[PDB]
Amino acid sequence: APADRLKALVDAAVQPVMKANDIPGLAVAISLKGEPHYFSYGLASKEDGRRVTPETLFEIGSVSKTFTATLAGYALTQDKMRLDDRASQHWPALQGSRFDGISLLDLATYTAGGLPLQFPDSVQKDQAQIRDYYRQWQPTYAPGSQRLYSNPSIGLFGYLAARSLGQPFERLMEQQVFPALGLEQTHLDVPEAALAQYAQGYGKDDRPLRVGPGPLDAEGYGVKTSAADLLRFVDANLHPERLDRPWAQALDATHRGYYKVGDMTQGLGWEAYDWPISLKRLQAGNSTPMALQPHRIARLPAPQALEGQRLLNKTGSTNGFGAYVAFVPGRDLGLVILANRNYPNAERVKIAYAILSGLEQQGKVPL
Ligand SMILES: *[B]([O])([O])C1=[C][C]=[C]C(/[C]=[C]/C([O])=O)=[C]1
């Protein structure tokens, strides 16, 4: 069985990284032909020696954007919105602004014209300040020309998706998306009954950190989930057809690529690579420059189905937490790495690659 070699492989990938980045706790979940394998390391909380388990809740940060994309997928396949809709079509308070000339697709894929990585400090979690921010916003770049990774960009995408469905974003996620995907350990707001499972996050000098409120936090970076639940989400992405048709279609909608930057094809939330690919190249696709700097896009003649021999991934970080997810449809392989430190993306990719590559090499013919 390929499973027989997993424990040694995962320990080897994980433990050196945990040591070098002083990571208090880390959970791995791997799906091999739909069968889950869990590896838990260290402490969810140092103050009270609570061990990480597959049910420990971590902040997954921007991995939340794949859930947001799924809600948007559902809106799209229910004909509540279309990707070439003007943004202001779904929020009348934006009519007259730059959002008259920006598409939903632009927002979704960070190409609206240089919406920043995060809202300025001064924008509070308040409909009217958010509205006013977008009403006064002026672009850096022409739309559809430059990718600049952006919470306010895809955050507005998610918010407008919710508006097209006629319900608050948080309500749709909690009452329709999470249940559709069979996720009972996944939260935007961790309830009373589950607080005991919420890991502590650790920042510089081991400052304890859990994510605070912010504008469009639910849409951009607000999910808390367990390694076991996030692997259920990954398995739903590997086999959407196992869901009821509306939700199967919603997931398929997130697996469509619109443009390339270097080796990376941008989907809705998901970012995709050809598989196999080299470690160095996967790291560069997930680099600090990819996250922080503008990049010229190579637009595709037509949206590409992100299927077959490809790797789809998303990193996610908060002040206290560092997550990574990946799946490879042509290997029926899913992977989740959740940690309670924000440690470098390159190290997350190192772990994931050791695992993916290790499994790849058992499937060779001897001599
Ligand atoms: B991801 O994770 O990538 C992101 C982006 C942007 C922003 C954010 C926020 C965070 C906190 O605050 O935590 C995220």
Author numbering: 3 to 369
What does the publication say?
According to their amino acid sequences, β-lactamases are classified into class A, C, and D enzymes, which utilize serine for β-lactam hydrolysis (SBLs), and class B metalloenzymes (MBLs), which require divalent zinc ions for substrate hydrolysis. AmpC β-lactamases are clinically relevant cephalosporinases. They mediate resistance to cephalothin, cefazolin, cefoxitin, most penicillins, and to β-lactamase inhibitor (BLI)-β-lactam combinations. In many bacteria, AmpC enzymes are inducible and can be over-expressed by mutation thus extending resistance to broad-spectrum cephalosporins i.e. cefotaxime, ceftazidime, and ceftriaxone.
Inhibitor 3 is covalently bound through the boron atom to the side chain oxygen atom (Oγ) of Ser64, adopting a tetrahedral geometry as already reported for other similar complexes. The catalytic and conserved residues in AmpC β-lactamase catalytic domain undergo minimal rearrangements upon binding. The boronic acid oxygen atom O13 forms strong hydrogen bonds with the −OH group of the side chain Tyr150 and with a water molecule W567, commonly highly conserved in AmpC binary complexes with aryl boronic acid inhibitors. The meta carboxyvinyl lateral chain of the ligand molecule is placed near Tyr221 and is stabilized by the π⋅⋅⋅H−C interaction. In class C SBLs, the carboxylate group does not interact in the typical carboxylate site of antibiotics as in class A SBLs, but, on the contrary, is oriented in the opposite direction, towards Asn152, Gln120, and Leu119, where usually the R1 chain of antibiotics binds. The major structural change involves the region near the phenyl ring of compound 3 and comprises a conformational shift of the side chain residues Gln120 and Asn152. Comparing to the structure of native PaAmpC, in the crystal structure of PaAmpC: 3 the side chain of Gln120 is rotated by 50 degrees and the side chain of the Asn152 accommodates a flipped orientation and show a shift of 36 degrees. In contrast, in the PaAmpC:3 complex the inhibitor points its meta carboxyvinyl group towards the opposite direction, extensively interacting with the aqueous solvent. Compounds 3 and 5 do not experience improvement in affinity compared to lead phenylboronic acid 1, thus reflecting the lack of strong additional specific interactions for meta derivatives in AmpC binding site.
